[PDB]
Design a protein around this ligand. Structure first.
Ligand SMILES: *[C@H]1O[C@H](CO)[C@@H](O[C@H]2O[C@H](CO)[C@@H](O)[C@H](O)[C@H]2NC(C)=O)[C@H](O)[C@H]1NC(C)=O
Ligand SMILES: *[C@H]1O[C@H](CO)[C@@H](O[C@H]2O[C@H](CO)[C@@H](O)[C@H](O)[C@H]2NC(C)=O)[C@H](O)[C@H]1NC(C)=O
Ligand SMILES: *[C@H]1O[C@H](CO)[C@@H](O[C@H]2O[C@H](CO)[C@@H](O)[C@H](O)[C@H]2NC(C)=O)[C@H](O)[C@H]1NC(C)=O
Ligand SMILES: *[C@@H]1O[C@H](CO)[C@@H](O)[C@H](O)[C@H]1NC(C)=O
Ligand SMILES: *[C@@H]1O[C@H](CO)[C@@H](O)[C@H](O)[C@H]1NC(C)=O
Ligand SMILES: *[C@@H]1O[C@H](CO)[C@@H](O)[C@H](O)[C@H]1NC(C)=O
Ligand SMILES: *[C@@H]1O[C@H](CO)[C@@H](O)[C@H](O)[C@H]1NC(C)=O
Ligand SMILES: *[C@@H]1O[C@H](CO)[C@@H](O)[C@H](O)[C@H]1NC(C)=O
Ligand SMILES: *[C@@H]1O[C@H](CO)[C@@H](O)[C@H](O)[C@H]1NC(C)=O
Lengths: 160, 324, 324, 160, 324, 160
């Protein structure tokens, strides 16, 4: 996306990973599988949750009765009332429409950014001990069992 | 041994639009557009509305013979008129400041209908039993409004009347009345004799006077005569005096009410049920959770800002790119 | 052997402003502010406007002797008044609910001017040829409005008149009239005799009555007398009755029209041409492509939201950093 | 910019590249020249195009006659009409002004991001087979003819 | 040997809210919400306001006996009424188009109070010294408005009066007057004899006529009679003529003023000081620097858009994460 | 943050650095200490300054008197006046509230981005001549005196 990770250098999503938004997939002599990164997923949720709340919570509305009723000799103020109604309903239409469009772009980037920081979080630990295959994958130059796979997930990968 | 870092995907079909690209399939989304309702007229904040059915506000307050079920009206948070609300001023005339009255009576706490000026002895030496027209027919029979009294003439004498009422109801009183306007001067005298009559309503906060405006005009639903309807809100402890030499359609019943705020008049043929709601519209009740709605521009209560949008979907998850 | 990845640059001078930095030169931009017009008054949606020139709405509808070209007026999507629009009520008085009428006649589909009450025999035993004033001079000569008829007195007798008209035009009819208000009672009687006259207009939807309000007042463009102008929209099939003992400036011509919507009155001295437009303003036609405009706060049609901005330029390309 | 590529680690633009927004410039024994990356340029266009459209398309306006006409005994509603006009015209002025300012910042970043992802798209393929000269340039440790130059452009650069 | 790149941190406690996270402690912030004032009523744009104190606009303009300090009123940029502003129409009646007058007199440049129709000889053969009521008591004594003159009857004769005034003040003149409405016809004649009187005010731009509307009504602060107050803005060079056979509370003093624009009426019990301000509110002066304010929905001048927010803090620095 | 630098791979702030927003801290045989990067700090200030100005400067307001005064027989236009007041004051409340929320997210990211570009600006020069310790620190594989420390700060670090 804006951070090249999503539908970018990691062009596909994992139907297999079902416990989180961003995460890992390993493959070693012992077996394979997915494991969502719980921290970045939780934090992402808290943020998206908080974000939706703001967009909803910040919308203040008082008790109002929109309709008016004007007689045939009050066309001018009736049209003024109209101008007000069309006016606000034009402001809220353009605003809501763009607030979503703009915030949607921001949420996808956000996710993309989270993936890129994760992939980068790992590239950091592995350094020399793995080779990068341009697909969001790392191939250890050594053997990495489940404990070792775990270590990198919980950010504690040894001498690199 | 390899480890790959990636992202979630599923069978989601939700699509959102972004600044740079349309219909992007996303794994999770939330809707910010309330576009569904319940095709029912609910109680706005735990207080059912007032249904007028075949009648409209004017018919209800004046006492049109067709709005007898409305003589018990009590509470209500907003008024409901139907596409059938047509029983109003059965006797032709202008209901002065009608819109204004409709607007002010939108929301009412208490509302007691009391006999302010009793027909039975209140108008001595005045005919109080002829004020019945065919325009206001009650079951084939000729009748009249139930809250107003058409004071005619006693034999061949119509003396100057003068009744006052002081609001000791401990709340505002809605006093309604009317001034009759004969087509000529033959009816003007055959009914109120004094061809030069007048009607004057006085209050510490009101004083407009009247004189019949006899003139030739097209008959409406029967009569060529006309009746203007006037109302006024009489403050507590204030006194309203009436006195005339004719053409006075005197108040019979007035309403003692307690206005809290003001809503409006929903006009729809949708069913009324014991449901509740913070926001009500003509098509039905709307939810007050989302920041926007597109169900109807006209709403009553705390509502979601109305918009012309049909889709305001917000992404929460990431782009959906499955395929294994 | 080297390969470099870089970005485009050109001779562009377009500059945009950003949240963090002003006048950033960009390679490509788009303008979102419509700030140019065509200094011409066009046809709003394929329907040319109505030019009143030297006349204003009141003069046009009443029949001021200076607005004879306007007697054929037809169609129009909005009305144009000029800085020269001054021929209105050549005879002093208040044009009742004038603003309101101007507003309602803003947009008209069809508009036929017909002789509702013909001068030639319509007012038997009444002088219909003296109603000519000098305030309303037609080529040095004394004249009067062409759509209203000043009914004076026949010799030394002014009987009670009573003409009705029922709108069978299959559309609304605009009926205009007036009530004369002499300065004293010497003119009041020399013209309508009955020093106690009255004028009453009746309809199924109208009933206001009148009586001359003689009183001393400063002469305006000649007379110390006054004429209030009244109008009314007569629904199809409805009947309007007129009857008076004097002071009635009776309707001669009324207009049968078909209102579709309502626009407004553009007042500008700009030229009118056969161009078209979705949005019109006093200085000229505006484009309806951009989301904002700064040509004029007052506009008619589907227009771009008016803003105080002078520059709303959007970047489309990247920063421009040439130099080889 | 926000992604350090524009007027950043690639401080200048190419007047020479005239067929796209982002792209390459090579230099080998066979000759030199520019070649805009057609994909990222096209995609960028589609996006900026779609973006301008939204800002314009989402602006709803109904047939309205702003002016009103009130007589000397209607100063209060005339001032109310005024309040409405000034009101909306204050909302649309602040909004439009910032919508541009904010979206301009976003469009430049966007471009910057596109350049950085391209430069990164290449750094990936070349790996060890080229040395980075901090200016958005790569110097192959080997000979890279036109086919080879092409290969990296169309993302198919061999054993790195 | 190592070098690290990092970022600033300090003892800041400022917290801002972001789209993704609340109360983020930041090193530097700026406030965009003006929520403090000076509990003082200042001069709006270098022109102090007009304090009415115990009086309200009606009492001030009419000349209520309790508003004598206001007889020198000059300049003012906005009017200040207090929770004590209750001395108005000491004599019961409707102040016609009152709201409208209050609104138009909001801002005034110059304002000279001149004696338009001098009491001392201006009303020949008319009692000009009895027009004193107890409702309008001046120090226990019975008095009356200081700008209006209650013309009664001379012995047992009340002839038709007729005074005109032509505004040669080189600016607009505010003419105020009243029409008395006796409760019956015994007072009607004991004061103005002619039981059929009338009052007519004429101008090149005004002509409404009047007739006492005697009728029974509740006494207010003393009298059962009523006085409607009317005003009018007389253009330069125009003439206003008054003439009546009774019930005319004639103008004694009128005001020659110069309206520049229009502000409003701040109603608060806050102290008035020689401070200045671009934006004024009921609680005090507000700053016009920030784009938003929450001090009061009702403001006068160039003000910050009012919002229901309590906190609109903008980050300028980065997140604050100290700890060494 | 969005660029992983703040409270990210450089999890803490420097109370010690008191002359700028972003900067350095060195440690060599000769001594240690902080030195804010003056350029990126200045530029950041200019930008944040300019940004706050826009949010304030772009707010246009004309001389207005909000209050109105309507009598008991003008409840309808009084409620219309109300609708206008509540209307605008609902638009400005939702707008201001989100303008801040959104711009705050943008300012923090901005800072984060500035730090990441600085850290990256350095990683570039040092290349092979230093080892990255995942904390925003570089450890020269050689000796780097004050002049050398200076050189990297003013972007002129030698043969890497
Ligand atoms: C109240 O409204 C009804 C319904 O409009 C009146 O009846 C009218 O419509 C009837 C057809 O459904 C017909 O009876 C007439 O068209 C018309 N009424 C007449 C003239 O008979 C009804 O009369 C009204 N009742 C009253 C007295 O107010
Ligand atoms: C219609 O308007 C014209 C133009 O205002 C009237 O003429 C006025 O202006 C003329 C100068 O251009 C002068 O003739 C007068 O100032 C004035 N008219 C008079 C009093 O002669 C014109 O009279 C008007 N026509 C009618 C009858 O309505
Ligand atoms: C002007 O206002 C004052 C204050 O309201 C009037 O006095 C009223 O209040 C007084 C108590 O503070 C009492 O005197 C009465 O309640 C009432 N006035 C009466 C009827 O005495 C005062 O009279 C007014 N002055 C005038 C003449 O306008
Ligand atoms: C989609 O997948 C979910 C599992 O999360 C399952 O519950 C649901 O039935 C599926 N529906 C479709 C569209 O196949
Ligand atoms: C997206 O494409 C168009 C708009 O670009 C829209 O009409 C359609 O509904 C969407 N198509 C699908 C099903 O993704
Ligand atoms: C700018 O360059 C374009 C080529 O794209 C050329 O057509 C135009 O004439 C040039 N104008 C200027 C400002 O030199
Ligand atoms: C940009 O600088 C100022 C605003 O910062 C502006 O007045 C001027 O027109 C611009 N200068 C140019 C030509 O880039
Ligand atoms: C915070 O630190 C500043 C130094 O910039 C100092 O002036 C101030 O007194 C300190 N206040 C607190 C909260 O300790
Ligand atoms: C932040 O937390 C809540 C809102 O999340 C707020 O009420 C409180 O004032 C803040 N706490 C502090 C002191 O950081």
């Amino acid at each position: 996306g804006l951070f090249g990770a999503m539908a970018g250098f990691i062009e596909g999503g994992w139907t297999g990973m079902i416990d989180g938004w961003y995460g890992y997939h390993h493959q070693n002599e012992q077996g394979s599988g997915y494991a969502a990164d719980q921290k970045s997923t939780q934090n992402a949720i808290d943020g998206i949750t908080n974000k939706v709340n703001s967009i909803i919570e910040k919308m203040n509305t008082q008790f109002t009765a929109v309709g008016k009723e004007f007689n045939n000799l009050e066309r001018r103020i009736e049209n003024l009332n109209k101008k007000v109604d069309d006016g606000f309903l034009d402001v809220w239409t353009y605003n809501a429409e763009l607030l979503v469009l703009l915030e949607n772009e921001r949420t996808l980037d956000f996710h993309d950014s989270n993936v890129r920081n994760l992939y980068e979080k790992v590239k950091s630990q592995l350094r020399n001990n793995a080779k990068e295959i341009g697909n969001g994958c790392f191939e250890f130059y050594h053997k990495c069992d489940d404990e070792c796979m775990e270590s990198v997930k919980n950010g504690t990968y040894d001498y690199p | 041994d390899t480890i790959c870092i990636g992202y979630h995907a599923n069978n989601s079909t939700d699509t959102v639009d972004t600044v740079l690209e349309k219909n992007v399939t996303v794994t999770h989304s939330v809707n910010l557009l309330e576009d569904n309702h319940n095709g029912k007229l609910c109680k706005l904040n735990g207080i059912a509305p007032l249904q007028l059915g075949k009648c409209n506000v004017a018919g209800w307050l004046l006492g049109n013979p067709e709005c007898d079920l409305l003589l018990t009206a009590n509470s209500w948070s907003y008024i409901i008129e139907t596409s059938n609300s047509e029983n109003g001023t059965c006797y032709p005339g202008e209901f002065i400041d009608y819109e204004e009255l409709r607007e002010q009576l939108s929301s009412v706490s208490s509302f007691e209908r009391f006999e302010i000026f009793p027909k039975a002895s209140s108008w001595p030496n005045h005919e109080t039993t002829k004020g019945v027209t065919a325009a206001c027919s009650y079951f084939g029979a000729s009748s009249f409004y139930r809250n107003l009294l058409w004071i005619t003439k006693k034999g061949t004498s119509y003396p100057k009347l003068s009744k006052s009422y002081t609001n000791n109801k401990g709340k505002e009183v809605l006093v309604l009345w009317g001034v009759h306007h004969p087509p000529t001067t033959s009816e003007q005298q055959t009914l109120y004799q004094n061809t030069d009559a007048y009607v004057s309503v006085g209050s510490s906060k009101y004083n407009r006077r009247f004189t019949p405006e006899i003139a030739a005009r097209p008959k409406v639903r029967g009569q060529a005569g006309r009746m203007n309807y006037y109302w006024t809100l009489l403050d507590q402890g204030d006194t309203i005096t009436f006195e005339a030499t004719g053409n006075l359609i005197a108040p019979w019943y007035a309403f003692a009410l307690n206005k809290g705020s003001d809503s409006g008049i929903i006009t729809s043929d949708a069913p009324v049920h014991n449901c509740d709601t913070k926001c009500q519209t003509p098509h039905g009740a709307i939810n007050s959770t989302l920041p926007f709605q597109n169900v109807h521009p006209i709403t009553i209560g705390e509502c979601p800002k109305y918009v012309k949008s049909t889709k305001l979907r917000m992404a929460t998850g990431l782009r959906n790119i499955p395929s294994i």
